[PDB]
A paper describes a structure:
The [name]-1 capsid is a fullerene cone made of quasi-equivalent hexamers and pentamers of the viral CA protein. Along the body of the cone, the CA subunits are assembled on a hexagonal lattice, with the CA amino-terminal domain (NTD) making hexameric rings that are linked together by the carboxy-terminal domain (CTD). Twelve CA pentamers occupy sharp points of curvature—termed declinations—exactly 12 of which are required for the capsid to completely close.
We incubated the WT CLPs at high concentration (0.27 mM CA) with 11-fold excess FG peptide to ensure saturation of available binding sites. Images of the complexes were collected for two independent samples, and then structures (6.0- and 6.3-Å resolution) of the declinations were solved, imposing no symmetry and using a large box size that encompassed 1 pentamer and 17 hexamers. To visualize the detailed interactions, we refined one data set to 3.9-Å nominal resolution. Furthermore, superpositions with published structures of CA in complex with FG-motif peptides indicate that the closed-gate configuration of Met66 in the hexamer is compatible with binding, but the open-gate configuration moves the Met66 side chain into the phenylalanine pocket, causing a steric clash with the ligand’s phenyl ring. Our results suggest that [name] and other FG-motif host cell factors, which are implicated in [name]-1 nuclear import and integration site selection, bind only to the hexamer.
Author numbering:
A (entry chain Y), D (entry chain Z): 313 to 325
B (entry chain L): 1 to 3, 11 to 85, 98 to 221
C (entry chain M): 14 to 84, 97 to 145
E (entry chain A), F (entry chain A), G (entry chain A): 1 to 3, 11 to 81, 99 to 221
The structure:
């Protein structure tokens, strides 16, 4: 799960 | 842009934004994107992608696909990882070094391949109708119908052979009755130009 | 790579000016010293008028087949760049004596476009 | 047969 | 058959009788009889012909047709026909190096008669075959070629029938496509050009 | 067959002729001919093909198709085909350690021609197959796969036909269930999901 | 068969192909295939299965089902199946004192697959079988037992079907007689009690 819904592209964890 | 990183032109960003905003998601978006992403770092890809204002729903579908591809990459390798490609956990300096080292690992290329893979699904979803429902109107001029059919074919997804068979047969099999006789009379080896010019008067 | 402005202009000409004999020399104006990748990129960008693009593809196919029959040494499909690398094309354009793959590709496409205009 | 119908220009085999 | 003469297996004659008593001498009798009697000594063929005796008229046309070839032959005509020769004699003619084919020649004569018989029982002449308004073209040819295989004219005349007469009698909807295809078009082209109409 | 050559049993050819004269070259001819000629020497296959001569058009497509493979072969092409070689020669090729299969190769060529013949006599193209409003789905597939086995396109194209085209042409009541089942569903799942509808 | 291996007679495969291409995998295929392949060496059975290849979907279910039994077997699984073993090897297993039955075991596996295939092509589930208002009861059972032989549930479940479900779905005029006959009544009693109704 690299990218979570709602979070912007490339937003760090 | 690698020269050292180089900032992307505001002109390029504006052009890509306008392309996405106006062109819906018609297929020509795929190469246009490829036109504006020559030698771009994954951080640059994220910066380009985030700026899209509308169509946020479709973008989300794209996000999903990325995860899947990333997962597969994480399955291949037990050295950048799957999340490193997306740039969510990689520095600009590290990304520059990865594709500036000799030999260079194409992080930008693989990210772009992933994004294109997603965009294909997006286009297919936004495609209005399937290739099979394209039928010629009784009074429709033949040129417009041929162009409509070919646009739809460029939209649909299948391997090369399926497309070859579709071009060879479906177009003829769905024409209007008037041109149907002429087309079936022309033969199987007629090029497109002959077929269109034969029914040009009609 | 071509500037987005130059690429955009070629799109507008096809979209706005529809199809007319003036297009063909216009295409030469924006294609000066263009690598085969550049030609492919400029071609694919055309959104509408896909049937004419199909006709141009068929003409390119016939010309490449004739070239292959007539004869790393470029092959029939090597010219269009669909079976080649950017490095190889850059070398051919840079190696002395240069072998103008771009020139012959442009000639084939110009012939196809002339055919398209003759259709209209 | 350099370009099959339907495929994009320059599409590798 | 020969292996020393070998009598025809009992079930074989049953198959041959099943052909005569049920097919009404349809144009497909000739191939079946050409198979069930393969490699048969001339005495054997007379055994099969006894089952044609059920039709007094049909058997008669064979007796004349054989007799004409019997005299025209002049092993004599009445010997190759098995009227006078014996079983051992026939084998000797066949089991020879090089052989003198008696059984095959006898089989050649019969088919001439059976061809004559088929023309008589043929249901309709070729000139009356007309396509139906909704009849699929794929079925129409199969009906046509059956009749043509029966009418049994010379070789050249058949070619004219299948190049012009076939097109002429087609239904108006199909006649347009076939005529537009051009003269001399092969059979394969015509059917494909009218596959679904 | 070989046991020394063995001639084909008389009733066997009767079965083969019964296939040609009655099935109208339906897509099921290929299996039957693939069986009745199993382990047959190349001379024997010519014996069976003489029964195809009843259809002037059909026999011709075989003569061309064999000839193309005959020249493409260059035992020579006219020898494996039995046009020039003799019976004893063919056995020697087959009765060899390791054998050079002449009969099987000949059988390979014919099926190519018979495939060409079937496509011609095929009644309707696949794209015209539409489900009936009350037609049971179990019967519809059997009708469909018969046509698909005839149309004889490449392998990959068939898969696209049976994964999307089949669903597309279904009747609206069944189309709902099939589409709801999801893409890539196997054939077994689709029939069970529409068993009684 | 074995007499030294003996190849299957040519007409036999013709009968087997006639079953597949025409019966549409009706529940009666299992007995016929259980007969035409009696005493057949494992290589022979592969020869018959090549005629099932005409149906891409049907042949696939056999390939999986054999493979499951092939691995579950671990002559190895790929040897008894004839994928790797040779003709002479199979005979040695069969021609042994005491024999190790390879051919019979292979035949056991196939019937499992063919049972799976029949359930797929089965026209209707058992629960939808209803007697007609005027349908004779003698015909109704024959229709019913055909479906039940296909549905292929366990042994015990079938008994409940033929003791209660059969009576339940009968028409009202017959339902009165059958119910009045009493529980546990045998099949013979039920038919006689409704012979002419």
């Amino acid at each position: 799960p690299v990218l979570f819904p709602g979070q912007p592209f490339g937003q760090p964890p | 842009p690698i020269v050292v990183h180089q900032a992307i032109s505001p002109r390029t960003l504006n052009a890509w934004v306008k392309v996405v905003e106006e062109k819906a998601f018609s297929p020509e978006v795929i190469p246009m994107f490829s036109a504006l992403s020559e030698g771009a770092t994954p951080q640059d890809l994220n910066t380009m992608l985030n700026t899209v204002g509308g169509h946020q729903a479709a973008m989300q579908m794209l996000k999903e696909t990325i995860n899947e591809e990333a997962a597969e990459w994480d399955r291949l390798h037990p050295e950048p990882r799957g999340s490193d490609i997306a740039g969510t956990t990689s520095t600009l300096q590290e990304q520059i070094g990865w594709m500036t080292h000799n030999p260079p690992i194409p992080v930008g290329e693989i990210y772009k391949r992933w994004i294109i893979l997603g965009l294909n699904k997006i286009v297919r979803m936004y495609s209005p109708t399937s290739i099979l429902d394209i039928r010629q109107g009784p009074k429709e001029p033949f040129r417009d119908y041929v162009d409509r059919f070919y646009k739809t074919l460029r939209a649909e997804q299948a391997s090369q052979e399926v497309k070859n068979w579709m071009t060879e047969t479906l177009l003829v099999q769905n024409a209007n009755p008037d041109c149907k006789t002429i087309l079936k009379a022309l033969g199987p080896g007629a090029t497109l130009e002959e077929m269109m010019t034969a029914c040009q008067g009609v």
